[PDB]
Amino acid sequence: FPQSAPHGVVFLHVTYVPAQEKNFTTAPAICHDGKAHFPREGVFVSNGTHWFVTQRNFYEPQIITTDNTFVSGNCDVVIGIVNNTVYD
């Protein structure tokens, strides 16, 4: 938002700042039936026993499903792959 001042101008900027972060455990890919799975838009996050997918700038876990992932590859190339179940 702009404001007028003598011999000058003043701007009022509105921004977005994250807060209250939490540490998690993550994996680059998920293996299932000998196929690799990568997230469409998000990152795999584990809370200790289960695995979810969430957006990067806000914590909102979801159930891993074939609608937010793509296979695109095999299970013997990626380093650090973790194998779990993908619901249909």
Partner 1 sequence: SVAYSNNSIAIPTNFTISVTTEILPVSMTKTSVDCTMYICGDSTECSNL
Partner 2 sequence: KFNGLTVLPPLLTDEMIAQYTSALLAGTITSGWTFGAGPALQIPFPMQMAYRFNGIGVTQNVLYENQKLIANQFNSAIGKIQDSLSSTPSALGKLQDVV
Ligand X SMILES: *[C@@H]1O[C@H](CO)[C@@H](O)[C@H](O)[C@H]1NC(C)=O
Question: Contact residues for partner 1 (CB under 8 A)?
Answer: 5, 7-27, 43, 45, 54, 56-59, 80
Question: Quick check: 21 binds ligand X (CB under 6 A)?
Answer: yes
The reply on whether position 65 binds ligand X by CB under 6 A is no
- Check: CB of residue 37 under 8 Å from CB of residue 71: yes
Alpha-carbon span 66 to 64, nearest angstrom: 7
Q: Could you say which of 32, 73, 75, 86 contacts partner 2 (CB under 8 A)?
A: 73
Q: Is 53 exposed, middle or buried (0-12, 13-18, 19+ CB in 10 A)?
A: buried
Is position 85 an interface residue for ligand X (rule: CB under 6 A)?
no
Closest approach of partner 1 to the CB of residue 42, in Å:
10
